[PDB]
Every structure is written in C-alpha cells, then in structure tokens.
C-alpha cells in the first residue's frame, strides 16, 4: 500500500494473506467472511496472460498476521484450500470485469482477538455508504512504492499497512482511464492538488476496501483491490470490485449445496 502508515494490532481481524507454496512468496491478500470461507480477486489465481491457473495444491492461506514474514506462532493460523470458485464471467481479457473468487478453507478456523469475519453489505447498507466523498479503508502487505525499489528505501512493508481513501464519482473514474469501466467496479482515491495521497499497489490485490456503518457500528466490505494504472499516480485512481453487485453470485455458490 502506497503512502500509508503501519497498521495496529487487531486492526483487520479479517485480513487474510494468500501465500504461494513454491516459491514461498506473497501473492495477494484476501478477506474472511466466515470460519471456512475466504474472498479474493479472481486474477490472483487465474490470469492466462501470465500462464497462471493455480489450483488448491499451489497455495496456502495465512490469517491473524501482522509482520508479513515472521511465522507469528502465538496467533497465525495456516490453512489448506478445499475449493476455489472463480466467477463464470470474469473478463480477464479486456478489463478484469467481475474480478472475484471464493475460497473454502479445508477446515474451519478458530476466531479470536486476531481473527474475525467482515460483514458483507446488504442493499440498504449499499444505499447509504457508497457515496462519492465518503471514505473506506484499504490494507495490505503489497509494495509501498511503485517501480520495485523506486525512491527512498525498500519498497516492501514489514507489517500490515493502511490508508483511508475517498470514493470517487463515476464520471471521474470513467474520465481518468481508457479502459471500459463497468458497473461491477468502483474507483477510489484523492484528486490531484487535494493535498492527500495514498493507493493500493502490487501485492495488495484481493485486499478489503472496508467501510464502517454508523448505523450498527460494524465494518462492511464494499470492494476488493483489483487493478489500476501505476501506484499513487496523479489523475489516476485505484479500481475495486464492486462486491455488493456480485453478492447474488456468492449466495449462489455458498448456498447451492456447499456441504
């Protein structure tokens, strides 16, 4: 995450990390919706342009982490995946439209002071929170700077990172890029000359874009860090999967006879 600050302990109890098996590297991030279901961005598992189509035997999940590298024994829970569910109309060839995927932990995990699920937004909640100018949270273990070792020091975080970013009006999102924006994706960020900065960056893919309903004081996941044009660039914005729109499909998967 670009232009952010270290996270606190227990700030994102749902912040899941997608770790590749061999090599032992970071892939993306994800979210926890129940003791057994985990949500990400499809392009983290299936992205043909990179000769990439990972199966369960190709990755591990890691939850309850803070430092992105040390095996935090006291709290970290590692999991194997039972099933991967990529959205049937994930448009990877043109603009990652419907860039989403569900994952089922091969064995339910234990919740704790460091492990808790985010709430998915309902229609009413989508109504009042999703408004240009309102802020949401992005957290991740991805790059802190753009071009791998770009300007100050190392570009990888030691601990989880966070930034709070503003939702942007659709016309501005559409105007900023030459890619076919769809209704299944919103963009966020600070306008140029608005002072503040901050953005997602290579490594954050799949990370939760969260909002806190004042209505019930709970945290909801509106989107999923998907794609963008460079990190923290002027006049460009970060694009997230509009989760609420695709909720109908998650319901289908989970409830169409899971177990």
């Amino acid at each position: 995450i670009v232009e952010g600050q270290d996270a606190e302990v227990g700030l994102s109890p749902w912040q899941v990390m997608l770790f590749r098996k061999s090599p032992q590297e970071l892939l993306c991030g994800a979210s926890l919706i129940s003791d057994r279901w985990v949500l990400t961005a499809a392009h983290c598992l299936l992205y043909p342009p990179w000769d990439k189509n990972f199966t369960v035997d190709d990755l591990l999940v890691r939850i309850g982490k803070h430092s992105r590298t040390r095996y935090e024994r006291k709290v970290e829970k590692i999991s194997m995946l039972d099933k991967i569910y990529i959205h049937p109309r994930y448009n990877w060839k043109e603009n990652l439209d419907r860039d989403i995927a569900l994952l089922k932990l091969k064995r339910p995990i234990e919740l704790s002071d460091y492990i808790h699920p985010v709430c998915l937004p309902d229609k009413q909640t989508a109504a009042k929170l999703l408004h240009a100018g309102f802020k949401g949270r992005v957290t991740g273990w991805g790059n802190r700077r753009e071009t791998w070792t770009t300007s100050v020091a190392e570009v990888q975080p030691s601990v989880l990172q966070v930034v709070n970013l503003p939702l942007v009006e659709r016309p501005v999102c559409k105007a900023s890029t030459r890619i076919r924006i769809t209704d299944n994706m919103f963009c966020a960020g600070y306008k140029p000359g608005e002072g503040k900065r901050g953005d997602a960056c290579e490594g954050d893919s799949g990370g939760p874009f969260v909002m806190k309903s004042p209505y019930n004081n709970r945290w909801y996941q509106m989107g999923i860090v998907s794609w963008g044009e460079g990190c923290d660039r002027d006049g460009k914005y970060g694009f997230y999967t509009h989760v609420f729109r695709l909720k109908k499909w998650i319901q289908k998967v989970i409830d169409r006879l899971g177990s």
Partner: protein, 103 residues
C-alpha cells in the same frame, strides 16, 4: 500514452528483467518497455537476486524437544518447528503423528 500499457492487476508475480532488475509482475515489466526501454525482455520468473532468506521460525527458539512426524516423513523437533516448515522448508506439510518418523 493514454493509460493502457500500465494499467495492471495489483498481484505479485515477480519476474527478472533482462536489465538485471526485478519487476512486480509481467505487466509492469511491459509498461517499463513502453516508457523508454524497448529492448526490455524477461529472463526468468522470480526476482533477479534471491530475497533476504531470514529467520521466519525465529519464534520457535527454546522450544522443548518433543518430536512429531510430518506428512513429509521428516521428524520435526516440535510442533512449532513443524508449523513453520509449512511456510518455508516443507510448503504445506502437516502433522502425521506425534513421536519420531517410523522407519
């Protein structure tokens, strides 16, 4: 330009650029090509120079010896050692049975 060869997914899939440099993923490796480095080509996946292979299991130090056998037939010193092996030494390994591996 016109915002297209640099739009990319924020996924990590490190590759080693021919210019001796590591690229976040094959997309950025291309964007660089479209901004001055036409000669740029990939060479192999994985960073050019290996990462600082540190002490991930650094927290299992001092753990009392209590061996357990992992699904990989490697007798581990203790659970903690084993758990940690799964994110490093033996990706994904898991407890087969307590006590030394039966051989």
């Amino acid at each position: 330009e016109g915002g297209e060869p640099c739009a990319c997914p924020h996924a990590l899939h490190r590759v080693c650029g021919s210019d001796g440099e590591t690229y976040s993923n094959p997309c950025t490796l291309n964007c660089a090509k479209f901004n001055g480095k036409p000669e740029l080509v990939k060479v192999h996946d994985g960073p050019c120079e290996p990462d600082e292979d540190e002490d991930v299991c650094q927290e299992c130090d001092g753990d009392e010896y209590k061996p357990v056998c992992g699904s990989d037939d490697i007798t581990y010193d203790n659970n903690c050692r084993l758990e940690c092996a799964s994110i490093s030494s033996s990706p994904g390994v898991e407890l087969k049975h307590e006590g030394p591996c039966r051989t």
